[PDB]
Write a protein that binds this ligand. Structure first.
Ligand SMILES: [Mg+2]
Ligand SMILES: [Mg+2]
Ligand SMILES: [Mg+2]
Ligand SMILES: [Mg+2]
Ligand SMILES: [Mg+2]
Ligand SMILES: [Mg+2]
Ligand SMILES: [Mg+2]
Ligand SMILES: [Mg+2]
Ligand SMILES: [Mg+2]
Ligand SMILES: [Mg+2]
Ligand SMILES: [Mg+2]
Ligand SMILES: [Mg+2]
Ligand SMILES: [Mg+2]
Ligand SMILES: [Mg+2]
Ligand SMILES: [Mg+2]
Ligand SMILES: [Mg+2]
Ligand SMILES: [Mg+2]
Ligand SMILES: [Mg+2]
Ligand SMILES: [Mg+2]
Lengths: 34, 137, 87, 92, 91, 142, 125, 203
RNA sequence: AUAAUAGUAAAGAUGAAAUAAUAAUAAUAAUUAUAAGACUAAUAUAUGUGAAAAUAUUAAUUAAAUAUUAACUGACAUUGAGGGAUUAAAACUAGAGUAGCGAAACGGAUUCGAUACCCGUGUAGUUCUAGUAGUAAACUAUGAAUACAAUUAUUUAUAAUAUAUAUAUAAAUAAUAAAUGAAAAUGAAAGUAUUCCACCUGAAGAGUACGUUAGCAAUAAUGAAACUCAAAACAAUAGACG
């Protein structure tokens, strides 16, 4: 990986983290009791 | 034991040497006794390091196991020599839990011991069994 | 002592070579005059000849009189003076 | 008390640090210059400047290495130029 | 009368040369210019500030191996001894 | 009793401002030997004239500058001359290597500190440094 | 185990400075000998001024009397001696440090070794 | 064999040393073997060394350390002043004798110390030197006073009846300019190999 | 930080300014005197040491460590799936601690705007003790082992030399030869060979989803497919640009 190539990966990782943050309450609801 | 000495000395021999020196001086009491006591204190195990004691223990083990006077390197004697160190290393670890480098070192040492006993078993099984029995394994 | 061998360089040269020429006579005279005037009040006749000398110096121009080949040698002798191993 | 009196500020001279000099009345400027030189030798202003901010330990180590390299290069250059000068002098 | 810096005093028993009287000689001389180097571990001197203070700057800093001009090991021993000294009261 | 042994001229020269301070070392002539010796070693001081370059009417940014510091030094020297603390010897000290430090020394050298210099026995720096200590602020990006 | 010691003792009394030092030397030497130990040498050093005004608990000191005690002991003994030194009010700075006996048996104090004399035999002669 | 010839040959004859060519310390005797050329050999830059020597050198004599170095230059200095000092000493004709009561070493495991003189003088002390004018009792030599006096390639201790003010105090530290005559009394030689001459100022 | 001393109007900050537990309740600077944490200036080269994370104020204890000789063992070795242990910073759970720094938050600037860069308050955190967790550009972006190959210069240690010389060894570091290589360059390995393990097979989608295991948790490991392209990537070259 060059830095430029890495930056796409970084961006992807950030997006994933954001998604996880968004779907925290939903995830909690899904997890407990089933 | 109470009158055991470090630095590869023996108490009986030391006293004899001192007496011989005295005789030589005469040829050519309380103070002399005090000097002798001072010497003993200097050369005692209990004032010396643990390292000297370990060395002595290793020597004793070698003497016990050697299949002839010269033997150092007999698979059995090697194992015996390893054991003393392991015991001491184990004791050290028991004092010092988080000393991870020295736990690793201990581990390596027992792996080495295992390996040499495995070898002994292949070479000379009865002898290996005897060695094991002696060591308490 | 600790010797320090450089790596292979593109070109051994001093960035700026100083000539180290002598300081100007007129400037020196002016400094001397200034020093004299620090003592002895403003303009006493102890520095009567000094002022005249300064004037003589700085008549045609403010300064009286108006390069070291070191790079050429370094450039010349770099390839020799290297301890660069053979080709 | 008598003993204290006898000890005429003997400790005061040796107790103080090396950042101190007795002024000659003929030239205070010279004394100041000497002090400045001493400070430079001890690297005290440069140390003070370094201490204004924090620099991550790996970063400061890298900087230190770079400085060392630069130093070693400069004395390697000096060595080279001295040789060049000698060659010039001789005829080479 | 003249200052000491611009006149080379040839010693008593020495040889000299016509060049030796010159400015250039003096310049050359100007250009070209101990117990720890003698061969004894400096970690004997940790109760001897007087001798360890020679290997230290006016403020108190330890001098660099470039300055002091020691064997690397011997330098490190000296440094250790100095640090021991300042841990104690003495030095 | 209160005998003035010597004066100490302190100059803290930071990035943004100077602080010039004059102070008398006040020894009393009037117990254990060790205690007396300790007292002799560290004689109490009394401040006589404090000064900072804003006191000379330099507002905000100009007080971090070289001329302002020089002016403050000159004012200090004038005060020393007038208020009559020139009978005993003087001890100069400094801190923090600002522009103003450079100004102060230049002022002392020149005619502005002409009367003071002859009493100045010793110059002696005392800038504070740390051998590790508290971590400094993060190095500003700008 | 040969341990060197360096204690910088207090000197309260002006006229008779060494008394407190002497008492300290006696006491620690007594402790050593009670506990299987053997003091070899008690090198005095001068009434030397401290580099800075060094302070103990609720006290201050500028001058002290310095000495080396070069004794043998166990490790535990030595540690306890060190602790006792740290505890007492009449010493400013204390420092025990090991002298290695893997090569030699006779070893002089650090000062004597620095001077030239490796063993105490040399000092005697 | 070739090896034998090499061992014999004139480069092997020059005993090796890595002493500084520039030594600003005290010089009591020659450091390096002086090496001359002939004029013809100089003209085609040949000194009997590994390489040619630069055409910038026009002096026939030199001193060297290394035949060839890593810098691709022979380490030399074009000067042979030490021969001239010896020749001056010979001209002066003051025979070196050991002031200590000892036999002359040239008459009768290894000792590296200097055997008598270093070979600057193999002259014997008992001779006189006649001339047209007569038998020379006092050896007259011109030298320069420094502050000690430089007398023909040697610094020498000096003595006089009265210190002359007119010559000295007129030019206090430019006494080196004016050459004065000297009467050399005797030359002793110490353990370090320094020639300790003793002169007397004549006026 | 608190207190005292004397002393006078600004102080502190910044590109320049302000806001603030700043200051006419008497500060800041100075000199003292207490306390508190946390850090370790020079030496320093991370040289070296450690399996790697790491590791430079001092001392002690216990552990482990180098070389060469002598003797002994007699292939007992190498590598190592699975497995095991250790594993920076952040994070988390307890209980202490909390000076300085400092996510967040609030305030002041900057700016068209400024959820920033700068300044001020400054909570988590950073600190210790006991744990959890097992990841980082955890990098020499280079798995371990053995045999071998052309030079030079530096140090370091070893031996002899007749302690200070010039020699023989190793070891490291720096320049290279050959060789290899897409080249950059590698240089006793990225060379010549042998052995063993790990891993890769276009780019996106994806280290994602689902599933399982482990964790107090954040998460860690394991790890697909559909859909869509003839792209996608590296070394070097010459420009243009800053
Ligand atoms: Mg890759
Ligand atoms: Mg094995
Ligand atoms: Mg902050
Ligand atoms: Mg490794
Ligand atoms: Mg450090
Ligand atoms: Mg770290
Ligand atoms: Mg944490
Ligand atoms: Mg907590
Ligand atoms: Mg902030
Ligand atoms: Mg764990
Ligand atoms: Mg991760
Ligand atoms: Mg990873
Ligand atoms: Mg790392
Ligand atoms: Mg090639
Ligand atoms: Mg290949
Ligand atoms: Mg490849
Ligand atoms: Mg390379
Ligand atoms: Mg599934
Ligand atoms: Mg995952």
């Amino acid at each position: 990986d060059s830095v430029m190539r890495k930056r796409k990966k970084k961006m992807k990782k950030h997006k994933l983290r954001k998604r996880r943050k968004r779907e925290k309450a939903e995830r909690r609801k899904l997890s407990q009791g089933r | 034991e109470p009158l055991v000495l470090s630095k590869g000395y023996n108490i009986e021999e030391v006293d004899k040497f001192l007496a011989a020196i005295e005789s030589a001086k005469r040829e050519r009491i309380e103070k002399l006794e005090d000097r002798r006591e001072a010497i003993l204190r200097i050369l005692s195990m209990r004032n010396s390091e643990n390292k000297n004691a370990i060395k002595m223990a290793v020597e004793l083990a070698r003497k016990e196991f050697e299949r002839f006077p010269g033997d150092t390197g007999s698979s059995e004697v090697q194992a015996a020599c390893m054991t003393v160190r392991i015991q001491n290393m184990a004791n050290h670890i028991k004092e010092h839990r988080k000393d991870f480098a020295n736990t690793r070192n201990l581990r390596i040492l027992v792996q080495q011991r295992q390996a040499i006993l495995r070898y002994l078993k292949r070479d000379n099984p009865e002898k290996y069994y005897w060695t094991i029995q002696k060591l308490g394994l | 002592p600790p010797v320090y061998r450089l790596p292979p360089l593109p070109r051994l040269k001093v960035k700026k070579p100083i000539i180290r020429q002598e300081a100007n006579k007129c400037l020196v005279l002016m400094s001397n005059l200034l020093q004299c005037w620090s003592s002895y009040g403003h303009m006493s006749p102890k520095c009567a000849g000094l002022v005249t000398e300064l004037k003589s110096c700085t008549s045609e121009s403010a300064l009286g009189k108006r390069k070291s080949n070191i790079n050429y040698h370094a450039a010349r002798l770099y390839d020799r003076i290297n301890g660069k191993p053979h080709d | 008390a008598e003993i204290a009196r006898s000890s005429v500020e003997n400790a005061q001279m040796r107790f103080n640090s090396g950042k101190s000099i007795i002024v000659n009345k003929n030239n205070p400027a010279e004394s100041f210059k000497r002090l400045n030189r001493i400070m430079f030798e001890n690297n005290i202003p440069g140390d003070k400047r370094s201490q204004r901010f924090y620099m991550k330990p790996g970063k400061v180590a890298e900087l230190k290495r770079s400085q060392r390299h630069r130093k070693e290069f400069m004395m390697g250059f000096k060595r080279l130029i001295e040789i060049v000068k000698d060659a010039k002098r001789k005829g080479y | 009368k003249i200052d000491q810096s611009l006149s080379k005093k040839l010693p008593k028993g020495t040889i000299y040369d016509p060049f030796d009287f010159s400015m250039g000689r003096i310049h050359l001389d100007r250009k070209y210019q101990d117990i720890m180097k003698s061969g004894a571990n400096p970690l004997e001197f940790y109760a001897r500030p007087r001798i360890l203070s020679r290997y230290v700057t006016s403020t108190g800093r330890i001098q660099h191996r470039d300055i002091t001009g020691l064997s690397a090991k011997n330098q490190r021993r000296l440094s250790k001894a100095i640090r021991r000294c300042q841990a104690i009261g003495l030095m | 009793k209160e005998e003035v042994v010597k004066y100490i001229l302190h100059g803290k020269f930071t990035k943004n401002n100077t602080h010039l301070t004059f102070s008398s070392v006040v020894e009393d002539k009037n117990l254990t030997y060790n205690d007396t010796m300790l007292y002799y070693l560290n004689l109490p001081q009394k401040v006589k004239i404090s000064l900072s370059t804003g006191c000379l009417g330099f507002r905000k940014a100009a007080r971090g500058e070289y001329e302002a510091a020089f002016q403050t030094s000159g004012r200090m020297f004038e005060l020393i001359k007038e208020k009559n603390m020139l009978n005993k010897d003087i001890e100069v000290v400094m801190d923090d290597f600002g522009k103003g430090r450079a100004a102060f020394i230049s002022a002392l050298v020149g005619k502005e500190g002409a009367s003071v210099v002859k009493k100045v026995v010793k110059i002696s720096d005392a800038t504070k440094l740390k051998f590790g200590g508290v971590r400094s602020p993060k190095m500003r990006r700008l | 185990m040969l341990y060197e010691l360096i204690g910088l003792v207090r000197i309260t009394n002006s006229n008779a400075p060494k008394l407190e030092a002497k008492e300290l030397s006696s006491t620690i030497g007594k402790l050593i000998i009670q506990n299987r130990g053997v003091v070899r040498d008690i090198v005095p050093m001068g009434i030397r001024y401290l580099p800075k005004i060094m302070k103990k608990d609720q006290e201050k000191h500028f001058r002290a009397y310095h000495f080396l005690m070069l004794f043998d002991s166990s490790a535990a003994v030595q540690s306890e001696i060190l602790r006792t030194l740290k505890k007492d009010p009449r010493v400013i700075r204390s420092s025990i440090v090991k002298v290695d006996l893997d090569k030699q048996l006779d070893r002089a104090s650090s000062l004597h070794r620095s001077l030239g004399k490796k063993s105490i035999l040399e000092l005697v002669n | 064999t070739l090896a034998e010839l090499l061992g014999r040959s004139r480069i092997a004859q020059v005993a090796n040393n890595h002493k500084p060519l520039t030594y600003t310390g005290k010089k009591f005797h020659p450091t390096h073997q002086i090496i001359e050329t002939k004029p013809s050999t100089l003209y085609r830059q040949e000194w009997g060394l590994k390489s040619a020597i630069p055409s910038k050198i026009k002096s026939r004599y030199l001193v060297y350390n290394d035949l060839d170095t890593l810098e691709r230059i022979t380490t030399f200095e074009p000067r042979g002043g030490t021969q001239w000092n010896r020749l001056r000493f010979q001209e002066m004709g003051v025979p070196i004798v050991s002031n200590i009561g000892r036999q002359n070493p040239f008459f009768k495991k290894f000792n590296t110390e200097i055997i008598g003189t270093g070979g600057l003088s193999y002259s014997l002390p008992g001779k006189l030197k006649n001339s047209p004018n007569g038998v020379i009792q006092r050896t007259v030599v011109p030298g320069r006073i420094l502050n000690l006096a430089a007398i023909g390639g040697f610094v020498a201790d000096v003595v006089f009846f009265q210190s002359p003010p007119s010559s000295f105090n007129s030019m206090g530290d430019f006494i080196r300019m004016k050459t004065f005559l000297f009467e050399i009394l005797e030359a002793s030689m110490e353990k370090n190999g320094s020639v300790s001459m003793h002169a007397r100022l004549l006026e």
